[PDB]
């Protein structure tokens, strides 16, 4: 009771004996339950606010799975606390909204780089500092993905703090013209804070919004999106067990 | 199944038939369950990611209680979607870390104004725009609080995107000297986006960190903090039922 | 002669024996003469540059009236020097240009908050810090105003350093859409610097420009505006004598 | 009465039939009375708020003298309105505080350039735009000054919106190290807005603060300062009558 | 004579018939002559200002070598004009100053990412946009380098516009603590403008300054540095001929 | 060999025994050869990268001529190193693109002031600091130019880091409306860094682009431009020998 407040990180609610060097983070608590379905020797470590923490084993390697909620600030709390617990490699398995015409639902966007349009990373360091993915992880992500059939795209994503501003339309058109693939709310924060803490980082994003329908298509779309999520998770697991 | 995706807001997962004009938001999903204990005719509306949504009745008035997770971006999603569902008055019942010496655990900070050191509100509008609380709500909050015994403080809070930066110490000292009462991660975003959407807004914050111990004191502190949380919730309910 | 330069503040030209804790500031030197007409036991304290300083008594309470000229920088000099002389409560009685269609000439705008689009306050502190009015003063201003007939509006004003830029039209339309009530040049500076110096602050503004005529209407308009000015002054006096 | 509001600029309260192409502006209304003592055929044109407006003749040339109060915003109003009335050449005759050790009271600083640390000019244009004095006026100012005995300095001044911030000491040391001669509140605004309106501009500043005493020295200092003011005025008059 | 001004890019002075899709850029004109020593079928294309342009063949592949002078602005001219001439892959072979203790002279820094502390890239796009190297090129650079003996480092470099500011020491210490490997003046500009133009980009930098000596050591150091330069060039040639 | 690295500045490759107090800088190395044609007792001092350094004598005065390449960063290196070698007066003889309709090719623009839209000067000091030309040099430039026939214009130039951005058209129209005469890439950097180092500075620019043709006109235009360049050089030489 008391010794736990002493031993555990105050948000993710785990300690250095529990956290693997290899971590997958996602926004959605329920996705953690879906990811661990792919793993053996699964155990619940912690449940606190938006942070749901499990361990499991994938091809002989223990990997921690941690939800972080929506947005850079809640991501950053998890990154900092995971690092304190001995994390060394962290892969975001997340969602994005497409910023280009021909990216379909359930296709994958692999963020090589991210536009830092969120305030979280800016609290740490000048926006001029690059948010980019680790080569060692990109190498293994690319090697896995080229050997299967679902389309995927390597490039730049934009991370931001709101898609509900009145200038959303103008932002979308501007960033589409700059060649951005998709947008999320968390990737640039992981890349900036993660790298500053000496972490290897990457982000694999399931596309869940077309850049721009009946019940049937709706069901088809949901299945495509679940398939993309499963592919993203598997890619991250295959990558992390090879480190 | 399909008609719900059509009818419901995509994150808070409720609609205009469900949401009251009077809303309490908090960060912690489990706090929603604790708040509804104070109300009659309670019903669960939605559970999705960090968003836990309930209705209840307090002295004859239906009030919606909604969790929003940690951070401006997840707060802003809830504010926008609640507004779309017909919200008119929104009170944050939250936590803060004290920025002055003599504010004890479980004492209350009522944010009249907030420093916009989070990126969420800045996506909407120049930082020069003021984040401040509505007079009509402050009037009722003050009237309720002056008539009881737990100490409380009206003034400025700072809202930010991370307390884990290496400059945290320097920030704390600078803001203490400027007379800031406490810090959270959400208040300025509610005040800025809320006001721009025509909402009446206020924020009542339980102090959960001293500016600067045995098992006994630890238990005493936890009880003080639970008491503050209950006081903050009651103050918000008493305020909203009087509108 | 010499001992005065020693004793008196270098711009407002008064000292701590002369200044009341309760102060009204306005831009126009001649308005000070008009305000003191409402008071008993009136005396001229100082006249220097744009700073005209008088004391008077209103319902038993000594109140200092001080002109400050146009603009944040000259306002800030007065605020700093008044504070040095023992001011604790300061109310701006000023003019504004309406930023919404149905605010008439001589109607009042009570600034709850102000957009800090002037450089004066920015010399002191990040623009993220809120410029807002003190609750204790707003309470008394509201109580007085609701009990009379001239229309008045509580909300946000914009304070700026020039209405003569070539982008004035675009500014007006943008700020009208954001719901700003009116604009002046001084309010945000009083609220920011004032609050940082521990002052209670508020601002009551006579509307002197329509958002958008014969000699008769011109005379009618001037009388409406003089009436608004008298109402603003009386509201400030009634508020300050009740502290 | 009515036709005047129609004909006159709304602050300086004069029109194009009254204003000379050649204008001296100063901050202090009473200095206008002191300047016109040096001129023939003197007439009062207008008195409104901090704006005191006179015409006079110096060696055959009509020159308008206009006070503007303290600060960029009130300066800018005067500059804009004077321009509307047909001003083409404008010289500030003002005061400064020395930013270097060996500049004495009543010695002159001629601003070739100004640091734009005031918000007024920034409302018009990016701070990157240069605030500098017109060569044609500097030529005549230099020619006059080299032929007399009071020391004077050509260089950079800093214009700002407050000397009362808590960082004043640090600003002073930083700007002294950069070689700035003195500081005022108005010069950069005149140079920026003036030049953008196609005006020839210059600024001659009497030093009234040492960078860093008995009644006798105090009297001596006041006389030195009055002498500097008279020299600055004469230099501006001699310059303007030669255009 | 005339038809050339018509056909050739105005600075690099070549056209689309001359430029290969595969390009090496360096700052120093004389380094181009040193690089082509490693190639067959060498020809001078153009010499204009700091731009020295040659073609050559390396293992069957035509590669253009182009000098760009010092600094982002001259780099950007070359990048834009090369792109206009059909460039698709561009590798900087350059120099850097080490920002960490144990990087020796003539060891290599491979920039995965760059801090955009130069104004050139900022003319194009918000500093939040990432400057990072292309995965396809990093893969081949890494594969080549791991198979030889000279030490090399993958990571972040800082690109800036001056190492002669008075704050240079403070910059060095700050950026060393953030884990930056070295600094140059050009890399972030190539990565930002290059990527926005759809180019594959990378940067291989010879270390020519220790973070912190006799004639003998001086000679040894020069030879180490020439060796590093040759290694960087060969790595770029080996990478480009494999595309 | 070794003692030179010890004695010489590391880029311009000369020392304090070689550099005159009076310096002309230009961007183009080959222009240095063209300038020295106008001088007696000419000697090559150094050739390194874009820096070509010569001395010569003009009417009895030794003057150093130094090329600096394109862009603020390479200019700034030269300015810093020249200053270290005892430079006191520096005149840029350069090229500009006209920003107004009736400035012809080979006519001269004399920069009184410069817009600091380049990052080099911003590394040293806030953009608010003015970039302007020295009066003593402008006086002599004006005196020389008024006594000949080629048209010339005194005013503001804009210095920037790229004319190849997609917003170039919008920049041109905006700056034309603000009254800017022409644009280059170097002038504001010389004026800012130069003045901060205590240098007298000026910039004389040959117009080489119309704001907005046969072989004949092309030849005529080239000759006009060569004539302007010769006039600019002569004006700088005549100015410097008179110091």
Automatic annotation (TrEMBL), chains A, B, C, D, E, F:
Catalytic activity from the UniProt record: uridine + phosphate = alpha-D-ribose 1-phosphate + uracil
Pfam families: PNP_UDP_1
Enzyme Commission number, as recorded: 2.4.2.3
UniProt domain Nucleoside phosphorylase: residue ranges: 22-205
UniProt entry keywords in alphabetical sequence: Glycosyltransferase, Transferase
Single GO term (MF): uridine phosphorylase activity
InterPro entries per the UniProt record, alphabetical: Nucleoside_phosphorylase_d, Nucleoside_phosphorylase_sf
One GO CC term, this protein: cytosol
GO biological process: nucleoside metabolic process
Record PANTHER family: FI09636P-RELATED, URIDINE PHOSPHORYLASE
Name of protein: Uridine phosphorylase
Organism: Aliivibrio fischeri (strain ATCC 700601 / ES114) (Vibrio fischeri)
């Amino acid at each position: 009771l008391y010794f736990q407040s002493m031993s555990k990180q105050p948000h993710i609610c785990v300690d250095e004996n529990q956290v693997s060097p290899y971590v997958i983070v996602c926004g959605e608590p329920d996705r953690v339950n879906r990811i661990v379905e792919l793993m053996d020797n699964v155990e619940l470590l912690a449940e606190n606010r938006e942070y749901r923490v499990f361990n499991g084993v994938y091809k002989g390697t223990t990997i921690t799975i941690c939800s972080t909620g929506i947005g850079a600030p809640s991501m950053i709390i998890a990154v900092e606390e995971l690092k304190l617990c001995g994390a060394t490699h962290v892969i975001r398995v997340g969602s994005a909204g497409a910023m280009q015409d021909h990216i379909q639902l359930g296709e994958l966007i692999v963020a090589e780089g991210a536009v830092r349009d969120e305030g979280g990373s800016k609290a740490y360091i000048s926006s001029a500092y690059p948010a980019y993915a680790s080569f060692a992880l990109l190498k293994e992500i690319s090697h896995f993905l080229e050997n299967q059939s679902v389309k995927y795209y390597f490039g730049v994503v934009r991370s931001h703090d709101s898609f509900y501003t009145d200038e959303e339309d103008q932002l979308c058109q501007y960033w589409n013209k700059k060649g951005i693939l998709g947008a999320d709310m968390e990737t640039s924060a992981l890349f900036t804070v993660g790298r500053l803490r000496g972490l290897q980082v990457a982000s694999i994003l399931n596309n869940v919004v077309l850049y721009q329908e009946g019940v049937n298509q709706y069901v088809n779309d949901n299945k495509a999106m679940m398939n993309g999520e499963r592919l993203a998770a598997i890619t991250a697991l295959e990558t992390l067990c090879k480190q």
